[PDB]
Amino acid sequence: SWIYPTVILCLFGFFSMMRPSEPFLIPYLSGPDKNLTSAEITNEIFPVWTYSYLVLLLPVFVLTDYVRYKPVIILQGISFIITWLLLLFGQGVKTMQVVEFFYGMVTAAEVAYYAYIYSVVSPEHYQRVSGYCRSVTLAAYTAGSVLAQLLVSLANMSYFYLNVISLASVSVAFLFSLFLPMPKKECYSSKRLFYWSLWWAFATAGFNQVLNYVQILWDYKAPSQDSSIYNGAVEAIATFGGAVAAFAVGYVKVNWDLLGELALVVFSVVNAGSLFLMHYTANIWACYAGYLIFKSSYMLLITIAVFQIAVNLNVERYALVFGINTFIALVIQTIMTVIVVDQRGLNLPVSIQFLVYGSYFAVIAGIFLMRSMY
Amino acid sequence: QVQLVESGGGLVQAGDSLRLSCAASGLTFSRYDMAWFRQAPGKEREFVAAITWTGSITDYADSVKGRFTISRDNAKNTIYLQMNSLKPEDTAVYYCAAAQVPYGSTLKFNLRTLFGSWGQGTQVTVSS
Ligand SMILES: Cc1ncc(C[n+]2csc(CCO)c2C)c(N)n1
Ligand SMILES: *[C@@H]1O[C@H](CO)[C@@H](O)[C@H](O)[C@H]1NC(C)=O
């Protein structure tokens, strides 16, 4: 009874997340296809994505439970096909701002993806269901990265054709969302629900901040003329680590009633220690290994957080809880990015940035490590 | 505001050598990719050279390659360009530019749409 919704949802996730053109977005926009200068891309186009994402995260989490999750998944599919038909056939800055608006709509609707399944599956299959859907997305992303790299390098394929392949993938993903079965008809009071949400908000803010400066750190540590290939390979390998880590959460048999905190504390230290390893160490290989541990360790916890939050929800407010925690994550990221990186703030270089990122995650582990009063 | 002033242009016999300098000020020089452009008398500005912010990559125009070597000095916030075996077609006014975004090379920004904030130019007249 739990097989059909899981299968179709995981097919939709895999096909939607498999987009080869993602790693080659900046080269595509500034390349000979559009010629959007670096200043334009970095100042008038990309920032629009954050604000559209933040604004559209409000209706999504306010109205994803009332209208059942399917409607939102279908809207996400339609938004995907327009982000990419406008990236394929869009020229100008205004058109790219509109594409960033539609991509903010796309990414703000992902709450319905992770909230839908618990509304159609029995509670006893919340553990297995949680792992599969998270893993299929990471496996899809790594597959897309590898395919794009091989095609560009070993076959000489222009970025336009990577965009065409991603468009086909997202269209095939949308074609599946029309078959998902339709479900049938202040919750933070619980400590377990609330405290897994506190990690979600703060930890997710730090994660998305690191991802934008890992590669710059590698350039600073080991300046090389072939760093581009090594940069891509490590990113794809790091994601595959998350896929196996998230998949193992829903496969290995363990009692999560008493191991809920222990995993949070134990694996919250690993995320701080790994970041301290990237910044401090001079070896570039150990810096590659630190990134794997950091990404895979985090993807392990986001699977338990979603599984454990949904277990303790008395009401069927899955999109509300998931959508408020991802909204506050953007709030922390946006405010904390201005303080640290933006010239208006501190203007820290990449050399010392990861001591703040590693120290930021150290506090998060500190709060949970200190939850012992005797 | 980023200011760039070039220094080194002049009149040199054919086959002599020159070493242009461009002392940048107003930005963290140790993050921005720098480049040299020229504007020959009768054409538009063209790319001549660029050196990544790490200093490990040096892209050159197909014409200059084998005679020009771009150099940078993050200690003095200065960028240089050694011209050797100057041919009569090297006549131009050389401008030094800076990437509009700090880590242009790392993010794979196209080089031909990355440099702005031009300088004031310096006349190089290589005569036969
Ligand atoms: C349509 C679209 N796709 C992905 C991102 C996320 N993102 C932020 S920065 C950056 C540059 C790296 O190539 C990318 C891809 C976006 N903002 N707009
Ligand atoms: C980018 O620049 C090249 C060279 O000028 C030009 O051929 C190409 O059409 C441009 N692409 C667009 C349409 O921005």
Residues A227 and B108 sit within 8 Å (Cβ to Cβ)? no
Q: Whose C-alpha lies nearest to ligand 1, atom 9?
A: A46
Residues 6+ apart with CB under 8 A from A195: A368
Determine which residue's CA is closest to atom 4 belonging to ligand 2: A32
Angle between helix A126-155 and helix A159-177 axes, rounded to 10 deg: 160
In degrees rounded to 5, what are phi and psi of residue A62?
A: -85, -25
Rounded distance between C-alpha atoms, residue A329 and residue A206, angstroms: 9
User: Kind and range of the H or E element at B12?
Assistant: strand B11-13
Ligand 1 centroid from CA A23, angstroms = 8
Nearest residue to A58 via CA among A334, A319, A306, A338? A319
Q: How many CB atoms lie within 10 A of CB B79?
A: 27
Within 13 Å of residue A161, how many CA atoms lie on the same side as its CB? 9
The CATH 1.20.1250.20 domain(s) of chain A lie at 1-185, 186-374
Rounded to whole angstroms, the Cα distance separating A108 from A55 reads 9
CB atoms under 10 Å from CB of A39, counted, come to 15
Please indicate whether, in this complex, the C-beta atoms of B100 and A215 are within 8 angstroms of each other: no
How far, in Å, CA of A190 to CA of A192, rounded?
A: 6
Architecture of domain B3-127: Sandwich (2.60)
Please say whether the beta carbons of B69 and B57 come within 8 A. Answer: no
End-to-end Cα spacing for chain B: 39
Identify from B51, B110, B111 which residue to disrupt to test chain A contact, counting A C-beta atoms within 10 A and taking the largest count.
Answer: B110
Q: Which residues pair with B99 in a beta bridge?
A: B115
Cα distance between residue B121 and residue B119, in whole Å: 6
Breaks in chain A (C–N beyond 2.5 Å) sit after 185
Q: Given B56, B99, B108, which is nearest A224 (Cβ)?
A: B56
In CATH, the number for domain A186-374 is 1.20.1250.20
Sign of the four-CA dihedral B86, B90, B94, B96: negative
Q: Tell me the torsion sign for CA atoms A308, A314, A315, A321.
A: negative
Identity of the residue numbered A266: V
Q: Are B102 and B31 in contact (CB under 8 A)?
A: yes
Cα B61 from chain centroid?
A: 11
Distance (Å, whole) CA A245 – CA A155: 32
Question: Between the CA of residue A232 and those of A141, A142, A144, A302, A361, what are the distances in Å?
Answer: 12, 10, 11, 24, 25
The C-alpha of A286 sits at a distance from chain B's nearest C-alpha, in angstroms, of: 20
The structure's method of determination equals cryo-EM
CA-based nearest residue in chain A for residue B29: A349
- The identity of residue B113, as a single letter, is T
The Cα B98–Cα B36 span in angstroms is 9
Q: Which CATH class is domain A1-185?
A: mainly alpha
- Counting atoms of ligand 1 from 1, which one is nearest the CA of A87? 1
Q: Which two tokens stand for residue B75?
A: 């200690």
Ligand closest to Cα of B112 equals: 2
Whether the CB-CB separation of A18 and A141 falls below 8 Å is answered with: yes
Whether the Cβ atoms of residue B6 and residue B25 lie closer than 8 Å to each other: no
